[PDB]
Amino acid sequence: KLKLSNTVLPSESMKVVAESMGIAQIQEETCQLLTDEVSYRIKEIAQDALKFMHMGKRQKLTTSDIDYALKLXXXXXXXXXXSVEQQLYYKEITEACVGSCEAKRAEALQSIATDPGLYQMLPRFSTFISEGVRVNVVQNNLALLIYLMRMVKALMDNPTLYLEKYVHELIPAVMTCIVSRQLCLRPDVDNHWALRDFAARLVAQICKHFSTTTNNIQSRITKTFTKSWVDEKTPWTTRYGSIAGLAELGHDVIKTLILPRLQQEGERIRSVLDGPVLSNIDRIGADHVQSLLLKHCAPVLAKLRPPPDNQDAYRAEFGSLGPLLCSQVVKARAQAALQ
Amino acid sequence: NYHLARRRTLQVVVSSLLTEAGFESAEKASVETLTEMLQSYISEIGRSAKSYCEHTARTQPTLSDIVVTLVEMGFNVDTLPAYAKRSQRMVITXXXXXXXXXXXXXXXXXXXXXXXXXXXXXXXXXXXXXXXXXXXXXXXXXXXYQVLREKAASQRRDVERALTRFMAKTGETQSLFKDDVSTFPLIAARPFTIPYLTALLP
């Protein structure tokens, strides 16, 4: 069932190595038997280093190993998927997701991210997690939002629990967290922008795993945010969540998208800036949104264009980017100088 | 893999000594081979001193031991102060690098339930019940007496009014008001041939 022929070096190459020292005119059978003899000693020593590492008990052979070799009819009532024990464990998980004590919070987060083999307090868990997402979208409460979104983050990093089959009741809750109207209070929309940042960051963590298949991920979320950006007369939370989600998709994504949207969204800027009579909620909202997305979009064209001619680059970017685009280009040159 | 950085640290020492020499260029594989030769020279010192200070019944290799070792290993030690003028006085010492950490975690369930049960050994840590043990789910008691018979009687009332609505709109219908097919469509009279066999029949 096996045949072990002799691994014999080509003797002409051996004569090349030999007469590299300039020996003589060599006949073949000499170097043939030389390769034979050296192959015997090599394969003997190979068995020997195998005896080494099969008592050092590793199946990989290092240089050091050979160095040491060189010392020579009513049915029965049902039963759930849970145990009572692990469903009470699940209740601990849920009320720690409620948990005010941040120690209990982080305990829950680690318990999510590092319980592999759990898999069975899967979807039911995640399913009316998503239902709680919908109900608290109605309730419009940022604390439940941040708790669930860090919960989804910790769900995303528990490496065994594969997402695939159970994806499709989770991602829309993320995007509903992205879109709009996270309005606890009008002076307190501030944390919601960071919520959207974190959410789009989570989407970026999603998108690197699943769009090999059916392209729900890339094609649907991109066209979603595309036509969402097209949606005129919408609140700027929608615009921020859309453009932030497109920002999280990557360098070349923005290179495609904000190539016309550079000056088109600059037109949106100077529709907002030097714009209305008075709506300072929307003014301050859209203004810091445009500023954030400006200097967050900046490293694309910084990697794309050289940082010359900031007066021309503002003309190349409809003026309002100038010189905040130029200041971000100075910051990018400083970050390059840090390297 | 993680062993390798000390070997490349020795390569850094090699480059430092070449800088003290003054070679602008080099042959890289020869440099690393010389580095291997250096670490084998270190280990050769160590083997020599190892088997040499076992000639005492005690272990600790002292200074003159290593003196006789290096003279045994062929070196004029008299240049060692003078080489100090080259060594710690013309080459800057490089620093080491080791970035070790112990991360934090917390997975607090509340179940131990057997500290050192019958196989008693007070050197372990019982995991939980949340992973190891299991349970059983019956999940449906529903035994609320008056509520139960409320359910049953309400359902009987439902089937009453259902069949009433069905044969109401089905058969001959006469009303209470005019044209109540919605609210009260009473079945009209059959009258049939033999009443007594019907009305006196259990």
From Swiss-Prot, chain A:
Gene name in the database record: TAF6
Family: Belongs to the TAF6 family.
Keywords on record: Apoptosis, Disease variant, Intellectual disability, Isopeptide bond, Methylation, Nucleus, Phosphoprotein, Transcription, Transcription regulation, Ubl conjugation
One GO cellular component term: transcription factor TFIID complex
Annotated function: The TFIID basal transcription factor complex plays a major role in the initiation of RNA polymerase II (Pol II)-dependent transcription. TFIID recognizes and binds promoters with or without a TATA box via its subunit TBP, a TATA-box-binding protein, and promotes assembly of the pre-initiation complex (PIC). The TFIID complex consists of TBP and TBP-associated factors (TAFs), including TAF1, TAF2, TAF3, TAF4, TAF5, TAF6, TAF7, TAF8, TAF9, TAF10, TAF11, TAF12 and TAF13. The TFIID complex structure can be divided into 3 modules TFIID-A, TFIID-B, and TFIID-C.
Variant or mutagenesis effect after changing I66T: In ALYUS; decreased interaction with TAF1, TAF9 and TBP shown by functional expression studies in a Drosophila cell line
Modified residues (Phosphothreonine): T114
GO MF annotation, one: protein heterodimerization activity
The species this protein was found in: Homo sapiens (Human)
Phosphoserine: residues carrying this PTM: S130
Record's subcellular location: Nucleus
Full-protein positions shown: 6 to 473 of 677
Record's subunit section: Component of the TFIID basal transcription factor complex, composed of TATA-box-binding protein TBP, and a number of TBP-associated factors (TAFs), including TAF1, TAF2, TAF3, TAF4, TAF5, TAF6, TAF7, TAF8, TAF9, TAF10, TAF11, TAF12 and TAF13. Interacts directly with TBP, TAF1/TAFII250, TAF9/TAFII31 and TAF12/TAFII20. The TAF6/TAFII70-TAF9/TAFII31 heterodimer forms an octamer complex with the TAF4B/TFII105-TAF12/TFIID20 heterodimer.
Disorder: Alazami-Yuan syndrome: An autosomal recessive syndrome reminiscent of Cornelia de Lange syndrome and characterized by delayed psychomotor development with intellectual disability, hypotonia, microcephaly, short stature, poor speech, and dysmorphic features.
Any single biological process term in GO: mRNA transcription by RNA polymerase II
Residues modified as Phosphotyrosine: Y119
Keyword Phosphoprotein in annotation: yes
Protein name: Transcription initiation factor TFIID subunit 6
Curated annotation (Swiss-Prot), chain B:
Induction: Induced with triglyceride accumulation.
Cell location: Nucleus; Cytoplasm
Domain Histone-fold: 8-75
Top-level lineage group: Eukaryota
Disease cited in the entry: Neurodevelopmental disorder with severe motor impairment, absent language, cerebral hypomyelination, and brain atrophy: An autosomal recessive disorder with onset soon after birth or in early infancy. Affected individuals do not show developmental progress, are unable to sit or walk, do not acquire speech, have poor visual fixation, and show poor overall growth associated with feeding problems. Additional variable features include seizures, spasticity, and joint contractures. Brain imaging shows hypomyelination, thin corpus callosum, and cerebral and cerebellar atrophy.
Function: The TFIID basal transcription factor complex plays a major role in the initiation of RNA polymerase II (Pol II)-dependent transcription. TFIID recognizes and binds promoters with or without a TATA box via its subunit TBP, a TATA-box-binding protein, and promotes assembly of the pre-initiation complex (PIC). The TFIID complex consists of TBP and TBP-associated factors (TAFs), including TAF1, TAF2, TAF3, TAF4, TAF5, TAF6, TAF7, TAF8, TAF9, TAF10, TAF11, TAF12 and TAF13. The TFIID complex structure can be divided into 3 modules TFIID-A, TFIID-B, and TFIID-C.
Domain characteristics, as noted in the entry: Ectopic expression of the histone fold domain acts as a dominant-negative mutant resulting in differentiation inhibition.
Similarity comment: Belongs to the TAF8 family.
General remark: 'Taube nuss' means 'empty nut' in German.
Quaternary structure note: Component of the TFIID basal transcription factor complex, composed of TATA-box-binding protein TBP, and a number of TBP-associated factors (TAFs), including TAF1, TAF2, TAF3, TAF4, TAF5, TAF6, TAF7, TAF8, TAF9, TAF10, TAF11, TAF12 and TAF13. Interacts with TBP, TAF1, TAF6, TAF10, TAF11 and TAF13. Component also of a small TAF complex (SMAT) containing TAF8, TAF10 and SUPT7L. Forms a heterodimer with TAF10. Interaction with TAF10 is mediated mainly via its histone fold domain while interaction with SUPT7L is via its C-terminal region.
This protein's name: Transcription initiation factor TFIID subunit 8
Species this protein is from: Homo sapiens (Human)
Upper lineage: Eukaryota, Metazoa, Chordata, Craniata, Vertebrata
